[PDB]
Here is the input.
Amino acid sequence: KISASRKLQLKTLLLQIAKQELEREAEERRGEKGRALSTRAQPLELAGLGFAELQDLARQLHARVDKVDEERYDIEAKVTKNITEIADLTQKIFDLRISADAMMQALLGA
Amino acid sequence: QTEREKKKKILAERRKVLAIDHLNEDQLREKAKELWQSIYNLEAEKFDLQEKFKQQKYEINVLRNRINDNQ
Amino acid sequence: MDDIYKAAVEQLTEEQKNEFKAAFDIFVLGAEDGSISTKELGKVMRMLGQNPTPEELQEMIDEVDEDGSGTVDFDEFLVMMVRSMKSEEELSDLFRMFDKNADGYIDLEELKIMLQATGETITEDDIEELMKDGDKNNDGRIDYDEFLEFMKGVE
Ligand SMILES: [Ca+2]
Ligand SMILES: [Ca+2]
Ligand SMILES: [Ca+2]
Here is the structure.
């Protein structure tokens, strides 16, 4: 129906917005990250706290570092079993499947 | 509690008294900022791992399709 | 792939179709029917480096010989000249961008949303045949494998 020169004209424009919606999704995640880290890692309110509540906050932070660190390890391990099986699927699906200038300069030259 | 729970509860309290209990209000303000930046860094690395997990399932699901469709 | 070459010839400025016509008529000096046999092609091959067998020379011809003459004329010569001049990791990420509903396939209306967000005035026949060229098994959708072979040759 339409020229073959058109069908490549439209593909070049698909991989141009699918490359624009790919990096717009990026800085829609950096904003999402900063927002989500202001809820989880709330900035500290250290002015006014006496020694008691200073030393109580420092202790509750000492116990949260160890809690957050394995909340991360348990998602760090899920993506480690997903990498291993991504390579399992990506493989088991593979087990089922002249020169221009060198020639124009020979016959011509300039 | 019992004793291996007692041992765990006691040693973890001993971990705080070793790093926090010899500090004054200024020396321990700095400790709180230091401990918070560690949390910001591990929560960021978790968020980055959380988003990769949402993506690996899509990749796994499409690989699940291609094996399902190519036999 | 194929129709990326055919599309390349239709975009050749007449500046380039004067270059190739000039060179092509140099190719076919001594040839009686004015076309490129293996006699003509082996000349230019020894002119630059190598010397293939008179069947390696008949494999470059039959690769673009679409009229069944065993020779190359000028219109076929242009296809020969564009052949002589992205990846799966790039395409997999862009595949996910067509697949808005995230089901693993690219159905019709997901193409149209993409097509209707491209800036061009998308006609129905455009939608009708980009779906026809991309989807080869005819299940009304472009899966992963079909999408790779559908962007083959698109920068
Ligand atoms: Ca021919
Ligand atoms: Ca879809
Ligand atoms: Ca299909």
The CA atoms of residues 46 and 52 of chain B lie 10 Å apart. The longest helix of chain B spans residues 25-69.
